[PDB]
Scaffold this active site. Structure first.
Site, mmCIF file in Angstrom:
data_model
loop_
_atom_site.group_PDB
_atom_site.id
_atom_site.type_symbol
_atom_site.label_atom_id
_atom_site.label_comp_id
_atom_site.label_asym_id
_atom_site.label_seq_id
_atom_site.Cartn_x
_atom_site.Cartn_y
_atom_site.Cartn_z
ATOM 1 N N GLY A 1 0.852 -1.294 0.107
ATOM 2 C CA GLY A 1 0.069 0.022 0.127
ATOM 3 C C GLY A 1 0.803 1.144 -0.215
ATOM 4 O O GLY A 1 1.701 1.335 0.792
ATOM 5 N N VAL B 1 2.787 0.279 3.301
ATOM 6 C CA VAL B 1 2.214 -0.823 3.868
ATOM 7 C C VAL B 1 3.182 -1.837 2.823
ATOM 8 O O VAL B 1 3.004 -2.219 1.822
ATOM 9 C CB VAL B 1 0.855 -1.405 3.537
ATOM 10 N N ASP C 1 -13.606 8.294 4.776
ATOM 11 C CA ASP C 1 -12.620 8.018 3.960
ATOM 12 C C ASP C 1 -12.898 6.390 3.469
ATOM 13 O O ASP C 1 -11.993 5.648 3.397
ATOM 14 C CB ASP C 1 -11.236 8.198 3.995
HETATM 15 O O1 LIG Z 1 -4.041 0.792 5.491
HETATM 16 C C1 LIG Z 1 -3.620 1.164 4.098
HETATM 17 N N1 LIG Z 1 -3.861 0.384 2.595
HETATM 18 C C2 LIG Z 1 -4.782 -0.627 2.462
HETATM 19 C C3 LIG Z 1 -4.210 -1.344 1.417
HETATM 20 C C4 LIG Z 1 -2.657 -1.579 1.313
HETATM 21 N N2 LIG Z 1 -2.658 -2.574 2.651
HETATM 22 C C5 LIG Z 1 -2.682 -3.739 2.880
HETATM 23 N N3 LIG Z 1 -2.364 -4.604 1.958
HETATM 24 C C6 LIG Z 1 -2.541 -6.192 2.491
HETATM 25 N N4 LIG Z 1 -2.732 -7.038 1.355
HETATM 26 C C7 LIG Z 1 -2.604 -6.936 -0.063
HETATM 27 C C8 LIG Z 1 -2.526 -5.654 -0.702
HETATM 28 C C9 LIG Z 1 -2.482 -5.492 -2.119
HETATM 29 C C10 LIG Z 1 -2.504 -6.693 -2.927
HETATM 30 C C11 LIG Z 1 -2.279 -7.882 -2.347
HETATM 31 C C12 LIG Z 1 -2.422 -9.228 -3.171
HETATM 32 N N5 LIG Z 1 -0.829 -9.764 -3.330
HETATM 33 C C13 LIG Z 1 -0.418 -10.171 -2.020
HETATM 34 C C14 LIG Z 1 1.147 -10.394 -2.020
HETATM 35 O O2 LIG Z 1 1.749 -10.437 -3.417
HETATM 36 C C15 LIG Z 1 1.388 -9.098 -4.109
HETATM 37 C C16 LIG Z 1 -0.022 -8.819 -3.921
HETATM 38 C C17 LIG Z 1 -2.272 -7.803 -0.964
HETATM 39 N N6 LIG Z 1 -2.642 -6.348 3.624
HETATM 40 C C18 LIG Z 1 -3.040 -5.554 4.818
HETATM 41 C C19 LIG Z 1 -2.585 -4.157 4.376
HETATM 42 C C20 LIG Z 1 -3.012 -2.960 5.266
HETATM 43 C C21 LIG Z 1 -3.063 -3.708 6.777
HETATM 44 C C22 LIG Z 1 -4.135 -2.910 5.792
HETATM 45 C C23 LIG Z 1 -3.084 2.513 3.869
HETATM 46 C C24 LIG Z 1 -2.511 2.789 2.590
HETATM 47 C C25 LIG Z 1 -1.116 3.070 3.118
HETATM 48 C C26 LIG Z 1 -2.007 2.652 4.575
#
Ligand SMILES: O=C(NCCCNc1nc(Nc2cccc(CN3CCOCC3)c2)ncc1C1CC1)C1CCC1
Ligand SMILES: O=C(NCCCNc1nc(Nc2cccc(CN3CCOCC3)c2)ncc1C1CC1)C1CCC1
Lengths: 626, 626
Positions: B18, B25, B137
């Site tokens: 992220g 992230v 948001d």
């Molecule tokens: O809280 C946020 N963003 C949320 C979107 C990205 N953040 C996360 N992504 C993920 N997983 C994820 C995000 C995008 C794509 C993918 C799918 N694939 C997993 C690994 O390989 C590549 C992508 C997995 N998990 C947790 C999080 C944080 C705990 C909330 C804010 C944006 C900066 C902080």
């Protein structure tokens, strides 16, 4: 990077697909179109140097076209080494070996997928027989798989005809290990392997140093048997003329498949079939259509392999051979209603049968409720060793077991959901046999009414002997009819909701699709199979970095926790609920067979009295005089 | 490699997940267990430096636990930079935006998946209201998705409460763009987006430079409408108070969903709902159970959203509001037999309904056969430009269209297979109405027999006026009964196989699962979606090598050929066969409604004469004398 090239093609050496003794197979593209092809580069080409004889041997394979054979497009020469390069058809899915590498096929291929394999392999070899060329070296690794336009797999052959210029060790004929008998041998070994997920003849420590004992197994030739496995180190060989319980194939298919393998798996050239006999029996199986039948009495599903031109007489026969139910007692139910089949009705006009919507079978003779018979396979012990090769082997094993448990679990749910339907149909079909008895009672009721008050009128006009006799006779009938009228209401009281026969227990016992137990099992199964394919990518790397070394150890321990969590949920939830549903099913059957016995007698006590009130209506009611 | 670390955690900077304005992230692991976590590293931390106020703001989110909220595990400091790092829960699947990126959801999420999204989002915000914190948001990017133990998706919130220290541009309230109204706004925009696959308020060239016109759209406030899209450059805005035809949601759900969005999508704070009103209407929808009903007359499937405590009276009402069929004419068929529902029967005890096994509805009043109403969407023009960004955008578009065509194709097959079942059940249900008429005829036949030969006997003993009158009266009945007896055999001749009513045409018209047209469409669809995800990996690389540049161009041209091949097969095979099946269905309906009209009258001409032969049996047959 490093990659070889050609006048029309090019490929990286990292895109290796097949590592043979004579040639190597690479994932290559075309310089112009960019379309992917299989690149077969000839290794060890120096002491031969053929440009006359071998050239025509490639010109014959070019025009050789078939659906069950990998196509040879062109014969080109390498830019630098000037090596003979074969432009083969690329198979993205891999080979039959690749399919068997999957844990989902650890205990044999799915039945539908197996029929495809059988159909394609037979069609392939037959085409090679038309050209005279014999393969013999037929291995799951030499049987490629592609996805057809209809989504179904298509199997092709490729590595053949390399005997003139030059079988697999676990696929060797005993006389060849030291006619066309040696060719049909490896086919049965392949067919058994695809249906079992294991080799037919296995020593204890595998076919290596203890393979000296393996040759003793093949030369042992127990004729009818098709399996020779020793469960202990250098012990006795456990023979078997049948297929394992863990086999995913239906009972109907195994009966047809067993004699095919048994007659192509022996050293005797006098007992072994020829290619004509082999083709005949195999083509026979492939032509047959499938009729889905679920025996409510035994709680077992069945797949009757029958031809479309066969009659219902042979159908009832085949059902008996699998359910032990006499043809005169095989009462059929379909789509909620009873189904009557004519003795000479063709199989082409049979109703639409599915595993989820088959033809139920109910009987009048007492049958023991068997249920699904499967093999209880427990998780294998995981060693704390770091052996990447061993970690990949045990990962395939422990995942395959859970796959089997998930396979059984979905079947256990199938049997229960099928049970709830058959019972729901039956109780409504019984009501149909109740409504007819009522209409066959009112006809008798009206009959006596116009027989009682017709003879009560003849005597109230004011001889006496005949009058009193009939009067007493009609009273003994109208009374006996009265109790049957009330006893049928007792049956209707049983058919009524909450009447000691309702299927309220069926929706309150076993497992349901609402529980999503199969999905829960799949979640853990996905976590395991992901780790499995990763261990394959660790075995190929020979050694790992410190970081990856620890992750490998972490996931290995989590592989056990996943399998244990799934195996517990399978036995403590899926199985236990099935045992409870199976128990209360055997009870309701007895309570149903008893009722149908009552209704039958109560109905037969209306026909015999219908003929009694027919010999009186045409008597005193109609006297005689000029 | 380059990777940051912590006292307990470590992560590579390449594993970015992220990219926010305040924090980033990363996919990180634990130093000991090795378990994966989400690493939230604070960027731009210098002009704040909070270790008192913000610390407690992290101590409150720690104890904050909910299923619909991403869990915060710990607050640790970086080894070198000493930046505040949040150890968040890792969501491997991604966010709601990731789900919408899929071509399979180009025209909205599946109905089941949408209900999950609605349920989780509402549950999440409600929990935040209990703690007082408002998000506003709320974007599909701020809504993470994980796979639960039962295989079903679970949606969680995460990026909230960052307003104190500091809505998305396409999710902004008009008054906020320049109470809790501004919070409920972005939710409707998210809900519309999940159900449509598109934003509710769209300019022509997108929300960028022409977004100045976009603000005019929102401030336009057409009240009841929920969509504002201009199909041309700086043209008029096409408003709509309903959802697009391409919406994958059932008709029953849209009726409930529309007023929810309409009352949370307007600038007026007096017309907009509060969080209590919003929660009430949303929770109402989520509590309702689904009853599957397929109208045979109209050839349409329906999903009736009803509560379990509701009666069958409201059920028939809801069916009418969707099928225009009067409750007194709604004849139900289930499991092969007719189904009678009590006016006050609860929905808890309704039969098991599925999309594949619903409750059929047949009527006596003429209904036009509509069939499936969908939106005809053609392939978009592919430009020869090399623009990687544009090549990825059009790849998502052209694949989404074929996904829609494959979605409709499977539904068209559903309607046909459902049609064949309902018709098969109906013709057998008619036979049930034929067998009753026979039994209601034989009762009249026997009646006249003991009325004819009883009065023919009284007069053959050898007054005359009464005798002749009844004799003629009984003759006019036994004769009129005779023709009905024969005309019913004509109906039985119609019910007989090949009797101008048989469903032989139904198995010889449209498409069948044997054709595997859906699987054929999926094969090409897989080839396209594979190229799509590849173009995503090309857009992220900004520029490609010469080799990869050509492969990109090759697959782009093959993307058109795949889509064209699929779109042709859809219209020329799947559609055309459906049109033929729909045609001969409307014909058979008229031939069936006509028959039921006959059988009804022929049956009613047995009851009225049953009462006629009841006023004669208690007359001259029973005279009077001392
Ligand atoms: O809280 C946020 N963003 C949320 C979107 C990205 N953040 C996360 N992504 C993920 N997983 C994820 C995000 C995008 C794509 C993918 C799918 N694939 C997993 C690994 O390989 C590549 C992508 C997995 N998990 C947790 C999080 C944080 C705990 C909330 C804010 C944006 C900066 C902080
Ligand atoms: O003909 C042979 N080997 C057959 C097994 C490997 N050869 C092939 N593999 C393939 N595809 C393939 C083989 C193994 C794995 C896979 C699956 N993935 C595809 C690409 O990414 C990695 C593996 C695909 N296609 C064609 C062929 C040649 C034309 C028969 C002899 C062995 C040397 C010649």
């Amino acid at each position: 990077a490093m990659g070889q090239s050609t006048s029309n093609h090019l490929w990286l050496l990292s895109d290796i697909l097949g590592q043979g003794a004579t040639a190597n197979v690479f994932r290559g593209r075309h310089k112009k179109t960019g379309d992917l092809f299989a690149i077969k580069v000839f290794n060890n080409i120096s002491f031969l140097r053929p440009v006359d004889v071998q050239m025509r041997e490639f010109e014959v394979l070019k025009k050789l076209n078939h659906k069950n054979i990998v196509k040879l497009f062109a014969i080109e020469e390498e830019t630098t080494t000037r090596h003979k390069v074969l432009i083969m058809e690329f198979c993205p899915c891999g080979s039959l070996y690749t399919v068997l590498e999957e844990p989902s096929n650890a205990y044999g291929l799915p039945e539908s997928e197996f029929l495809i394999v059988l159909r394609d392999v037979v069609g392939g070899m037959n085409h090679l027989r038309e050209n005279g060329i014999v393969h013999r070296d037929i291995k799951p690794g030499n049987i490629m798989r592609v996805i057809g336009e209809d989504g179904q797999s298509v199997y092709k052959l490729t590595d053949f005809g390399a005997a003139r210029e030059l079988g697999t060790e676990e696929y060797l004929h005993p006389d060849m290990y030291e006619g066309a008998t040696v060719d049909l041998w490896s086919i049965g070994v392949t067919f058994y392997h695809a249906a079992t997920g294991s080799l037919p003849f296995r020593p204890f420590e595998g076919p290596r140093r203890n393979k000296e004992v393996m040759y003793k197994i093949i030369t042992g030739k127990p004729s009818g048997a098709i399996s020779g496995v020793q469960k202990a180190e250098n012990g006795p060989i456990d023979w078997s003329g049948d297929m394992p319980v863990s086999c995913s194939l239906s009972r109907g298919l195994q009966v047809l498949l067993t004699p095919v393998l048994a007659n192509i798996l022996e050293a005797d050239q006098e007992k072994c079939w020829g290619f004509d006999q082999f083709f005949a029996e195999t083509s026979d199986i492939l032509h047959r259509m499938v009729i889905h039948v679920f025996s409510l009495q035994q709680m077992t599903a069945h797949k009757i392999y029958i031809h479309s031109y066969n009659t219902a007489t042979i159908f009832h026969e085949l059902v008996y051979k699998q359910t032990k139910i006499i043809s005169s007692n095989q009462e059929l139910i379909y789509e909620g209603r009873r189904l009557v089949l004519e003795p000479g009705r063709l199989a082409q006009h049979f109703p639409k049968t599915t595993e989820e919507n088959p033809i139920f079978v109910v009987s009048r003779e007492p049958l023991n409720t068997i249920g699904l018979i499967y093999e209880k396979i427990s998780l294998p012990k995981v060693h704390p060793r770091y052996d990447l090769d061993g970690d990949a082997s045990m990962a395939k094993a422990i995942t395959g077991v859970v796959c089997y448990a998930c396979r059984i679990a979905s079947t256990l749910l199938l049997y229960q959901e099928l049970m709830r339907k058959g019972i729901r149909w039956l109780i409504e079909l019984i009501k149909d046999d109740y409504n007819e008895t009522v209409h066959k009672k009112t006809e008798v009721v009206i009959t006596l009414d116009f027989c009682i008050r017709n003879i009560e009128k003849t005597v109230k006009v004011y001889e006496l002997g005949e009058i009193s006799d009939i009067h007493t006779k009609l009273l003994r009938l109208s009374s006996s009819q009265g109790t049957i009228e009330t006893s049928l209401q007792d049956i209707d009281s049983r058919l009524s909701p909450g009447g000691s026969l309702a299927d309220a227990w069926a929706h309150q016992e076993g497992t349901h699709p609402k529980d999503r137990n199969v999905e829960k099992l799949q979640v853990l199964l996905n976590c395991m199979t992901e780790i499995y394919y990763q261990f394959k990518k660790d075995k190929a790397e020979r050694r790992l970095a410190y970081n990856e070394e620890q992750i490998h150890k972490f996931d290995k321990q989590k592989l056990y926790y996943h399998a244990t969590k799934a195996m517990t949920h399978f036995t403590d939830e899926c199985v236990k609920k099935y045992e409870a549903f199976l128990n209360k099913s055997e009870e309701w059957i007895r309570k149903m067979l008893h009722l149908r016995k009552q209704l039958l007698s109560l109905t037969n006590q209306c026909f015999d009295i219908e003929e009694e009130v027919s010999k009186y209506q045409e008597y005193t009611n109609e006297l005689q005089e000029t």
